[model samples]
Target: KQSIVKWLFELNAKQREVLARRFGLLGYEAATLEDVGREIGLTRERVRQIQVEGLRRLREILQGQGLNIEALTQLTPEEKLLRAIF
Candidate 1:
C-alpha cells in the first residue's frame, strides 16, 4: 500500500534497505535475513533487530494516524475457520 511504502521510506537508509531486501520490495525478490545481512554487511542478529525496531516504529506511526486496531485485528474464530477450510 502507499501508506505502508511511505512509512517504510521514513526509516533510515539501512533500515529501509534491509527491510526492502527482506520483504522483496519493488522488483526485488524476498531474501532470508542472513542473505540480506550479508548484502548489507551486518550479522543476521543485527538484521533481525533492525527489522523488529523498524516494524515497531511503523506500527506506532500507523496507530498514531488513527488506523483502528480493531480493523487490523483479525477475528480468531474466523482465522481458525479459514485455516481449517483453506
Candidate 2:
C-alpha cells in the first residue's frame, strides 16, 4: 500500500534506500533489481541482504504497534525471527 510505504521514513536511512528500491518497485509496479541496484549503488545480493533486514525491522515496528505478523502474510525465516521476540 502507498500508505505503508510512507512510513518508510522511519527506517534508518541506509537501509531505507534499499527498502525504497524494493517497496517502490513492489507497491507501484515492477523492475529488475539490477536497475535499482545501479541507481542505489548496491549489488543485487547486498540489496537483497539489507532489504530482508529492513523488512524485518519494519515487521518489528508493526509488531510493536500490535500487528499480528503471522496472520497477515507469509513470512521468510528472518521474519519468523522477528516474531520470536514477542
Candidate 3:
C-alpha cells in the first residue's frame, strides 16, 4: 500500500503544492482554504478550484491500485466521489 502523499508528485507543480498546503501533507497543520490562498498568493476561489482539480487528478492516478466498486462501497458518498473518477 502506498501513501496518498506519495502520489502528489504525479500532478503538476501548482496542483501538488496547493493540495499539500491545503491538506497539510507538508508537515504543517491542515490549513483552511482561505489561509492557504493567502499563503500561496491566490484568491480563495482559485485555491478551492485547484484543490478540486488536484484531487480529481489524484483519483485517476490512484485508481490503478485496484480501486474498484467493492472498495468504493466502503467509503462515504463524499469520500467515494473523491476516490473514483468514473
Candidate 4:
C-alpha cells in the first residue's frame, strides 16, 4: 500500500501532478482542466494539452510492456491505478 501510493511520482513532476489531480489519483476528488490549471498556475488549454500528451507517452510505455491502454482508460480513476500494479 505504501509503495504504490507514491508510484506515480516517477514521472515528470508536472506530468505526475496534472495526471494525479485530473484523475483523482491522489486522495482528493478529481479535478477539471480549469481547476488543475488554477492550482498549477497554468492555463486550462495548457493543462488539457499536458493531459493528452502525457497520456500518449504513458500509453506507449504501458503498451510496450504488453498492457492494454484501452482497458486502462475505461476503468474508473481509482481502479485504473490499482490495475496498473496487479
Q: If the candidates were sorted by their TM-score against the true structure, best first, what order would they fall in?
A: 3, 1, 4, 2
The alpha-carbon lDDT assigned to residue 76 of candidate 3 equals 35
Per-residue lDDT of candidate 1, residues 1-86 (tens digit): 32355556777988778767776664556789999899899999999898877766665566555543332244432222122211
The 0-to-1 C-alpha lDDT of every candidate, in the order given, reads 0.63, 0.56, 0.67, 0.68
What are the models' TM-scores?
0.69, 0.57, 0.70, 0.67
What is candidate 3's lDDT per residue for 1-86, written digit by digit as tens? 33455556788878877777765565755688899889889999999899888777776676675444443344433333334334
lDDT of 4 by residue, 1-86 (tens): 23233446556888778878887777767898999999999999998888776665665544444434433356667565545334
Best by lDDT: 4
If both were scored by TM-score, which would come out higher, candidate 2 or candidate 3?
3
lDDT of 4 at 28: 62
How many pairs of residues collide in model 4?
0
Off by over 4 Å in 3: 66-86
lDDT of 4 at 26: 79
Model 4, stretches more than 4 Å misplaced? 1-7, 66-75, 79-86
The lowest-lDDT stretch of 10 consecutive residues in candidate 4 is 63-72
User: What global local distance difference test value does model 2 have?
Assistant: 0.56
